[PDB]
Write a protein that binds this ligand. Structure first.
Ligand SMILES: O=c1ccn(-c2ccncc2)nc1-c1ccnn1-c1cccc(Br)c1
Ligand SMILES: [Mg+2]
Ligand SMILES: [Zn+2]
Length: 313
């Protein structure tokens, strides 16, 4: 109980900031996650031995893919940490427990392929889970690891609290299906603008947590430009591989996934910022004002992609 995790001074300070990059030292990422759980949730939330065993089994079940890997899991959990720490009083004890774990586990066993590719390939998972295919798999993997001997980090919760936290985790992971984001944000936009948004309404809380999950999931676009630009390489490395696999199925992939069309990436990034990222952080900042730095950073990166198009870099 008296064993605190402590980071070097630069990490101790910068980990509080939304634009923090967890760095290239993979062996520091478990410690970074435990540090965040301890400060976000408490030193009492989890048995350290169980938490450490859970974290290391989660790591093992992320694959060696360019983007949807262990570093993405910890990066998304850090963005959730920053949101929770900047909104101290808004979230319940169970939400703080659930949401860092949901973020760490949200892409478990990702292969670097979209729901669309799994459906066109006729992958077994597409028959098991007709919608939100990979997201239902990610939740299934989370439950599998939680049920390994000595991995049940929630063991001190009551039957009803345990059911509640696993329901928070399921909804949070399903919400990372970007197909579901468009309608979720539109409903949240209407609720905020007509003033009907009510954080005591459980169905409203679910929507706000969904948008937080999208915001954390896309948080690569809220980093300093050099991080955002280099992460884009990893994102498109996966898109281009999926494009190659579409071509192997005898299907011309969309331009975004076609490596023959790299010239179109800058304009594609603009579309993504304007259609997905900026609207996401705008609605999140309206509902949770202290998350405004994510929107500011997103807008800075939009401006950088406009400079790339104008040949200014
Ligand atoms: O730069 C991007 C360009 C396009 N798309 C995208 C376009 C349509 N459908 C899905 C993704 N996402 C990104 C992006 C930026 C940050 N994260 N992601 C991301 C990547 C894969 C998957 C999920 Br979820 C998110
Ligand atoms: Mg995902
Ligand atoms: Zn993700």
């Amino acid at each position: 109980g008296l064993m605190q995790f402590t980071l070097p001074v630069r990490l101790c300070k910068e980990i509080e900031l939304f634009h923090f990059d967890i760095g290239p030292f993979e062996n520091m990422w478990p410690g970074i996650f435990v540090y965040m759980v301890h400060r976000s949730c408490g030193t009492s939330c989890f048995e350290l031995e169980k938490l450490c065993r859970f974290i290391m089994s989660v790591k093992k079940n992320y694959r060696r893919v360019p983007y949807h890997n262990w570093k993405h899991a910890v990066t998304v959990a850090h963005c959730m940490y920053a949101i929770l720490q900047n909104n101290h009083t808004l979230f319940t004890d169970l939400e703080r427990k659930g949401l860092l774990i949901a973020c760490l586990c949200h892409d478990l066993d990702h292969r670097g392929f979209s729901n669309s590719y799994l459906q066109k390939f006729d992958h077994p998972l597409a028959a098991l889970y007709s919608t939100s295919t990979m997201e239902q798999h990610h939740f299934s993997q989370t439950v599998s690891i939680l049920q390994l001997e000595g991995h049940n980090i929630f063991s001190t919760l009551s039957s009803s609290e345990y059911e509640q936290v696993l329901e928070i985790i399921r909804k949070a992971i399903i919400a990372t299906d970007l197909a579901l984001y468009f309608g979720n944000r539109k409903q949240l936009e209407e609720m905020y603008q007509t003033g009907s948004l009510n954080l005591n309404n459980q169905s409203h809380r679910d929507r706000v947590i969904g948008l937080m999950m999208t915001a954390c999931d896309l948080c690569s676009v809220t980093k300093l430009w050099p991080v955002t630009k280099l992460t884009a390489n990893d994102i498109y490395a996966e898109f281009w591989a999926e494009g190659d696999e579409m071509k192997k199925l005898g299907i011309q992939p969309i331009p975004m996934m076609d490596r023959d069309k790299k010239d179109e990436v800058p304009q594609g990034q603009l579309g993504f910022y304007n259609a997905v990222a900026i609207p996401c952080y705008t609605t999140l900042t309206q509902i949770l004002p202290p998350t405004e730095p994510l929107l500011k950073a997103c807008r800075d990166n939009l401006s950088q992609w406009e400079k790339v198009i104008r040949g200014e870099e």
